[PDB]
Amino acid sequence: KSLPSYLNGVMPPTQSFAPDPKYVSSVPCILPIIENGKVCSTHYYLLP
Amino acid sequence: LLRILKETEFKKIKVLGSGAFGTVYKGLWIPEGEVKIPVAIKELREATSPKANKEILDEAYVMASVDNPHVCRLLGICLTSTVQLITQLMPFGCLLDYVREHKDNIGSQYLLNWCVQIAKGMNYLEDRRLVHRDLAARNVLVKTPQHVKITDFGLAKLLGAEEKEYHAEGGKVPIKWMALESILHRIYTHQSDVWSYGVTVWELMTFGSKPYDGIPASEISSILEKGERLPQPPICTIDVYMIMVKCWMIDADSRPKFRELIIEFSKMARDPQRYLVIQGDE
């Protein structure tokens, strides 16, 4: 009943609302935080 | 109205967490002419400019004054070489952990009430002219499973009299919770908080899933521009999902307002089973 049907309950990473102009915008430098090998996977460096 | 604490007044018993902001402690507070109060102690570790310290303080004065069930009051502050925010301990912990660990003890009623409670708290802060800038399920805390609270780890901003925007300087930032204009332009507004409310809400309904799972944060701004957004949760009817999605409109002013979010989720919360279909919750 308007619930999403997925194969075996599995979500895809994303779902597209294209070509709706409210969701389509009509590429900066993101770096992880790593002290050996990621002490935090939710935050990143944001540079120009 | 904001209590300045001496270092003698309080001690850190245990570490509870770390991150970009710094470190959270289990702690004990003894006010001066007294009772021991179990507290959390957040130690901010960013080497602050004058600009940065003034901004934290101003945020702190506001947080000290809050009187709303759904927002944590700043009990005190200890400035030295580091800022330490002292706040009432929440032993139940954060909401992200709860929904991951206690999925089976969560029905539609709990979930939509959490949504309302967070909206109410976030609206309260918007009336206080505070851009929170860090809403995630990793920063909503459980007082009790019926009652949840928003907190800050020093990153919120008070907007001056004729300011709509806050322009951040660069830092460590939660890309997958951020509105697109905060990534491209580092602009933070009450409406960018709305975006992050949506993501918060997605996390709840997916019982703690990692958003955009398997897509590196480096690619996020692209897929957003192309119209890709977080998928519809398995338990969600279309009515709920469409509310979440409207928070991720490109035009920030066109997104819902926390006011509307309260009214909307509050209606749904009077007939929860209509709007969230959860196994065994019938």
UniProtKB/Swiss-Prot annotation, chain A:
Induction of expression: Levels are very low in quiescent cells. Up-regulated by mitogens.
Assembly and interaction partners: Interacts with ERBB2. Interacts with EGFR.
Function statement: Negative regulator of EGFR signaling in skin morphogenesis. Acts as a negative regulator for several EGFR family members, including ERBB2, ERBB3 and ERBB4. Inhibits EGFR catalytic activity by interfering with its dimerization. Inhibits autophosphorylation of EGFR, ERBB2 and ERBB4. Important for normal keratinocyte proliferation and differentiation. Plays a role in modulating the response to steroid hormones in the uterus. Required for normal response to progesterone in the uterus and for fertility. Mediates epithelial estrogen responses in the uterus by regulating ESR1 levels and activation.
Full-sequence portion shown in this chain: 336 to 398 of 462
Residues in coiled coil: none
Primary gene name: ERRFI1
Entry protein name: ERBB receptor feedback inhibitor 1
Reported impact of F17A: Abolishes inhibition of EGFR activity
Domains as described in the record: The EGFR-binding region prevents binding of a cyclin-like activator to the EGFR kinase domain, and thereby keeps EGFR in an inactive conformation. Also maintains EGFR in an inactive conformation by preventing formation of an asymmetric homodimer.
Subcellular location: Cytoplasm; Cell membrane; Nucleus
Similarity comment: family membership: Belongs to the MIG6 family.
Swiss-Prot record, chain B:
Record-listed ATP binding positions: L16, G17, S18, G19, A20, F21, G22, T23, V24, K42, T87, Q88, D152
GO CC field: basal plasma membrane; basolateral plasma membrane; cell junction; cell surface; ciliary basal body; cilium; clathrin-coated endocytic vesicle membrane; cytoplasm
Domain annotation Protein kinase: ranges: 10-276
Tissue distribution: Ubiquitously expressed. Isoform 2 is also expressed in ovarian cancers.
Effect of V66M: Found in a lung cancer sample
Reported effect, G170E: Found in a lung cancer sample
Annotated effect of mutating K42 to A/M: Abolishes kinase activity
Residues of the active site: D134
Residues modified as N6-(2-hydroxyisobutyryl)lysine: K42
Effect on the protein of changing Q84R: Found in a lung cancer sample
Source superkingdom: Eukaryota
Record keywords: ATP-binding, Cell membrane, Developmental protein, Disease variant, Disulfide bond, Endoplasmic reticulum, Endosome, Glycoprotein, Golgi apparatus, Host cell receptor for virus entry, Host-virus interaction, Hydroxylation, Isopeptide bond, Kinase, Lipoprotein, Membrane, Methylation, Nucleotide-binding, Nucleus, Palmitate, Phosphoprotein, Proto-oncogene, Receptor, Repeat, Secreted, Signal, Transferase, Transmembrane, Transmembrane helix, Tyrosine-protein kinase, Ubl conjugation
Similarity comment text for this entry: Belongs to the protein kinase superfamily. Tyr protein kinase family. EGF receptor subfamily.
UniProt function note: Receptor tyrosine kinase binding ligands of the EGF family and activating several signaling cascades to convert extracellular cues into appropriate cellular responses. Known ligands include EGF, TGFA/TGF-alpha, AREG, epigen/EPGN, BTC/betacellulin, epiregulin/EREG and HBEGF/heparin-binding EGF. Ligand binding triggers receptor homo- and/or heterodimerization and autophosphorylation on key cytoplasmic residues. The phosphorylated receptor recruits adapter proteins like GRB2 which in turn activates complex downstream signaling cascades. Isoform 2 may act as an antagonist of EGF action.
Protein name, UniProt field: Epidermal growth factor receptor
Taxonomy of the source species: Eukaryota, Metazoa, Chordata, Craniata, Vertebrata
Whole sequence portion shown: 703 to 985 of 1210
